[PDB]
């Protein structure tokens, strides 16, 4: 039977070249005798180039291949939460089967143009620099980009951790389920990752799709789609979901590897002509639906690894061009003490304030502005043998505001805590304080109001802004704390 | 089964079997040769012809020559009787001391440990090297990588770590030389012996050795790491011990593959590499790992072609490490050894929660100032130094002294530095830097800080220099 | 003060000019590396 089954003509470098299979559809899952699956990516006149999902040691010339008739779909819904699954949705945390009812297809088209509405609900990270100057809204696609080891995955993690404030809450329209896709990473990193998340009690609301370093190319390829589907189940059901693709750089490599082995034509950097289309069809599935559709959302934090800061290399160019903004991390900043290493001047949020809270805006706005102003003069500092007090002023606001954007890891803040601290320097209170102390000030200052003043923060929170009152109360709280502070 | 050779082109040999086609990865032995020639099956070309990679020279092979399927991937003698010995890619002793009488044999090809087999303990592994310890601490059971272009210190650094760590280590050690210099395996073997880590008379050997040097055909080079790693996995799993794995240089595994790649009929990926580089690296790097059964502390030297850290190979390897020591010819060029780049070296344990805030604040304190100085370098270059704020000409000072205090005379490079090797303890390091950063030595001269161990030697050296 | 003014006018104008040139040199180089790296891939692929 050459219609529903085929015979392997040759097998190598994970590409199977099957004879027969006359009825297979493009991208169909097929099965080799040995039990290994494969996906038909090249339907040629005289053969099927099949992408083997595993070790090609188990396939020989002549092995019989059969069709499944089924296209790639994966488990989905609420039972995956707190689980560690492979790219096919299989459980790899050895905790037992995932009790999944619904199964969704991994590659589906993004919701069209009509079914959506402007991104308007804040997606809070807990990171002041991001939350005040590179705001993410639900349905937005914001890229975290930077060289190796700059803090990229940390941003995502702090972000995931942060959602417990709302996940332990009652308001079900503020909860955000998290999905973390690990592509090309080593297993020890993910293990370490899931640990950090368990320790913070964030696994309860997180799903981990993992396609690691030793998993065949095709699984690394798929991973992001199969994780996307999982997040779509939430989006579609009036629920909100967050997805982190770590990294899109490694998946591009996986895809390039199959493309070239199937002999498709190579373009710049050896990438296939459809590499742009691989990510666009992925990153567009993130969106903010309309009430008519459930008002549910899917926010995506895709990671791209640049090289020597070459944001214009091929893949970094595509993805930058596809997403709504970028958080640019930099080594120089990192080693200079700015952690997280966000380059505030080049980072962006097309969505902008349409996603900031009124509380934040109340402060974010002037901060954004003195910083931009400092950035104009900063370089002068170190040779400012005699600058006027006009600009000498902006250098001072400059370094303090900058110290306020600093942040340790695993400790995401509540929007109310961020504005209280930002207010402190923005209003001028730390202007006479020593740069070397702002980190210590904030820490203790925030410890104090989180202890003693939970009623003002609750106000700020509730009233959503800084009332003329709470404004006055903060003035005293900081002018007395500061006095205390320099005793 | 018995196949015949149908084509020979370099390290690649195609074989035609009449009945029974040996599976991929199977090792075949060429009949009619003074020495054992193993061919690893690489692909099924179809027509009952397999394409294979030779584990040795292909000279004198003939079309039609006979080849027997061994029925299994390369399998080597694994067990305790490998310790103190020197092995081949294919498991043959190459030390002239007779057979290796192991109870068992293992195939060099195997699946990597599952996700549920991973461990997450993180213990700093002190080395005695100021720079590493201070800024990019190694971790027991972790994956360590020494990155460097030709001749910047990868091996010497591996040499001083064998001395400062392998030597006291209570557990085995496996040193796999992959595509490196033959002269070097002879230097190390004889050093192991002169220091009793290798014992030729008794069973007190604490190190097994495996070699596939630069004088070998691509094939051997594409596999020794596997052989090496396989020996190490035994002590990890079947004995459950604490292993120390040294590989110099893992880049050679990847260069090996790129060298036969075209003969395997593949369109090249970027920079000439083969399209399967990352996956080829992944299925290997994923076995070099600590599990719940045993612990591996791998120190891998990583060559950097053309000195370009973005080269697909060095670039693809960062993700497999928990700590990285990046060496730089720009630093070396100044006479600062070890030439580690303080701003490009990292460790997953550089966490206040793991090394402590004193350790952490010093490290970051040292890095800020070196960064601060890096930025000014290009500028005082042209515009000079007068206009600089006393605040800023002090960081130039302290930076230049730290830059030096980071160098150290290794005990394995006296032939190089003309200085006795010093090993500094973690607290002597943290403190020394803490004080320089604190302004406590702004009076001593930079030179006093160059090529010394502990901070007291910098003070003594100041006097000696005082005239 | 009139000579420092003059000297710093020039220096600044030389700098900017240098800036404009290095930038243009940067783009020429950036384009040639890509082209160069791509022709190399094609050559290898076509030879098969």
């Amino acid at each position: 039977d050459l219609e529903e089954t085929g015979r392997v003509l040759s097998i190598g470098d994970g590409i199977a070249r099957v004879h027969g299979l006359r009825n297979v559809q493009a991208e169909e899952m097929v099965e080799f005798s040995s039990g290994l699956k494969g996906m038909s990516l090249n339907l040629e006149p005289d053969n099927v180039g099949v992408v083997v999902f595993g070790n090609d040691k188990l396939i020989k010339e002549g092995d019989i291949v059969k069709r499944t008739g089924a296209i790639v779909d994966v488990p989905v819904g609420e039972e995956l939460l707190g689980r560690v699954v492979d790219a096919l949705g299989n459980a790899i945390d050895g905790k037992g089967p995932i009790g999944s009812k619904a199964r969704r297809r991994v590659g589906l088209k993004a919701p069209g143009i009509i079914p959506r509405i402007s991104v308007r609900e804040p997606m809070q990270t807990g990171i002041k620099a991001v939350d005040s100057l590179v705001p993410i809204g639900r349905g937005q696609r914001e890229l975290i980009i930077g060289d190796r080891q700059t803090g990229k995955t940390s941003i995502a993690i702090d972000t995931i951790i942060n959602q417990k404030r709302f996940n332990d809450g009652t308001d079900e329209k503020k909860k955000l389920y998290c999905i973390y896709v690990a592509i090309g990473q080593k297993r020890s990193t993910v293990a370490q990752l899931v640990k950090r998340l368990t320790d913070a009690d964030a696994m309860k609301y997180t799903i981990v799709v993992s396609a690691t370093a030793s998993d065949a190319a095709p699984l690394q390829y798929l991973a992001p789609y199969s994780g996307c589907s999982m997040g779509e189940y939430f989006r579609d059901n009036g629920k909100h979901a967050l997805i982190i693709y770590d990294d899109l750089s490694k998946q591009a490599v996986a895809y390039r590897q199959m493309s070239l082995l199937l002999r498709r034509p190579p373009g710049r950097e050896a990438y296939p002509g459809d590499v742009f289309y691989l990510h666009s069809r992925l990153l567009e599935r993130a969106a903010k639906m309309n009430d008519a559709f459930g008002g549910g959302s899917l926010t995506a934090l895709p990671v791209i690894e640049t090289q020597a800061g070459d944001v214009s290399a091929y893949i970094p160019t595509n993805v930058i061009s596809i997403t709504d903004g970028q958080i640019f991390l930099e080594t120089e900043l990192f080693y200079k003490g700015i952690r997280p290493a966000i380059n505030v001047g080049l980072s962006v949020s097309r969505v902008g304030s349409a996603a900031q809270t009124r509380a934040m805006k109340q402060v974010a706005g002037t901060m954004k502005l003195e910083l931009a102003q400092y950035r104009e003069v900063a370089a002068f500092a170190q040779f400012g043998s005699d600058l006027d007090a006009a600009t000498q002023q902006l250098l001072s606001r400059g370094v303090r505001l900058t110290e306020l954007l600093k942040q340790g890891q695993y400790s995401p803040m509540a929007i109310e805590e961020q504005v209280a601290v930002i207010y402190a320097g923005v209003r001028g209170y730390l202007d006479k304080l020593e740069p070397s102390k702002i980190t210590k000030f904030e820490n203790a200052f925030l410890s104090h109001v989180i202890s003693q003043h939970q009623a003002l923060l609750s106000k700020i929170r509730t009233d959503g802004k800084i009332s003329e009152e709470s404004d006055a109360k903060l003035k005293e709280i900081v002018t007395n704390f500061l006095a205390g502070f320099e005793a | 089964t018995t196949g015949r050779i149908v084509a020979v082109i370099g390290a690649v040999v195609d074989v035609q079997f009449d009945e029974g086609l040996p599976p991929i990865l199977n090792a075949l032995e060429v009949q009619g040769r003074e020495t054992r020639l193993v061919l690893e099956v690489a692909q099924h070309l179809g027509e009952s012809t397999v394409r294979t990679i030779a584990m040795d020279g292909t000279e004198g092979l003939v079309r039609g020559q006979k080849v027997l399927d061994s029925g299994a991937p390369i399998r080597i003698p694994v067990g305790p009787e490998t310790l103190g010995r020197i092995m081949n890619v294919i498991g043959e002793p190459i030390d002239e001391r007779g057979p290796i009488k192991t109870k068992q044999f293992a195939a060099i090809h195997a699946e990597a440990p599952e996700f549920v087999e991973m461990s997450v303990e993180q213990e700093i592994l002190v080395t005695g090297i100021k720079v590493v310890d201070l800024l990019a601490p190694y971790a027991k059971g972790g994956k360590i990588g020494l990155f460097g272009g030709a001749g910047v210190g990868k091996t010497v650094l591996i040499m001083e770590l064998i001395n400062n760590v392998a030597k006291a280590h209570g557990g085995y050690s496996v040193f796999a030389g992959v595509g490196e210099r033959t002269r070097e395996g002879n230097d190390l073997y004889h050093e192991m012996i002169e220091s009793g880590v290798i014992n030729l008379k008794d069973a007190t050997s604490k190190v097994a050795l495996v070699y596939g040097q630069m004088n070998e055909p691509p094939g051997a080079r594409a596999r020794v790491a596997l052989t090496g790693l396989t020996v190490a996995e035994y002590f990890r799993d079947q004995e459950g011990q604490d292993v120390l794995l040294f590989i110099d240089n893992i880049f050679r595994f990847t260069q090996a593959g790129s060298e036969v790649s075209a003969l395997l009929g593949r369109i090249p990926s970027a920079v000439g590499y083969q399209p399967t580089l990352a996956t080829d690296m992944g299925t290997m790097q994923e076995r070099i790992t600590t599990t719940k059964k045993g612990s591996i502390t791998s120190v891998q030297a990583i060559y950097v072609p053309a000195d370009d850290l973005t080269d697909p190979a060095p670039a693809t390897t960062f993700a497999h490490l928990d700590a990285t020591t990046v060496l730089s010819r720009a630093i070396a060029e100044l006479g600062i050894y070890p030439a580690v780049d303080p701003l490009d070296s990292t460790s997953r344990i550089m966490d206040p929660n793991i090394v402590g805030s004193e350790h952490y604040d010093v490290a970051r304190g040292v890095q800020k100032i070196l960064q601060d100085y890096k930025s000014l370098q290009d500028i005082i270059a042209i515009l000079g130094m007068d206009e600089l704020s006393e605040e800023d000409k002090l960081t130039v000072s302290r930076a230049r002294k730290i830059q030096r205090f980071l160098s150290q005379p290794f005990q394995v490079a006296e032939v190089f530095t003309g200085h006795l090797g010093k090993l500094v303890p973690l607290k002597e390091t943290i403190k020394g830097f803490q004080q320089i950063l604190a302004g406590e030595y702004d009076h001593l001269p930079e030179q006093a800080f160059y090529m010394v161990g502990p901070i007291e030697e910098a003070v003594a050296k100041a006097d000696k220099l005082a005239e | 003060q009139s000579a420092r003014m003059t000297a710093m006018d020039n220096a600044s104008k030389n700098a900017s000019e240098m800036i404009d040139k290095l930038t243009l040199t940067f783009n020429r180089t950036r384009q040639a590396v890509i082209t160069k790296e791509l022709i190399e891939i094609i050559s290898g692929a076509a030879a098969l």
């Binding site: 020597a308 800061g309 070459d310 370089a379 002068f380 040779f383 400012g384 600058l387 | 290009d378 500028i379 270059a381 042209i382 515009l383 206009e387 | 420092r4 003014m5 710093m8 006018d9 220096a11 600044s12 700098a15 900017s16 240098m18 800036i19 290095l22 930038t23 040199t25 940067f26 180089t29 950036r30 590396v33």
Partner: peptide, 25 residues
């Protein structure tokens, strides 16, 4: 002519130009 070096030089000249224009005024 390395995109790295070129960038290193641009970095230091953009600052020079800035500090130098300041000193002029």
């Amino acid at each position: 002519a390395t995109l790295k070096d070129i960038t290193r030089r641009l970095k230091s000249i953009k600052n020079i130009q800035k500090i130098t224009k300041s000193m002029k005024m």
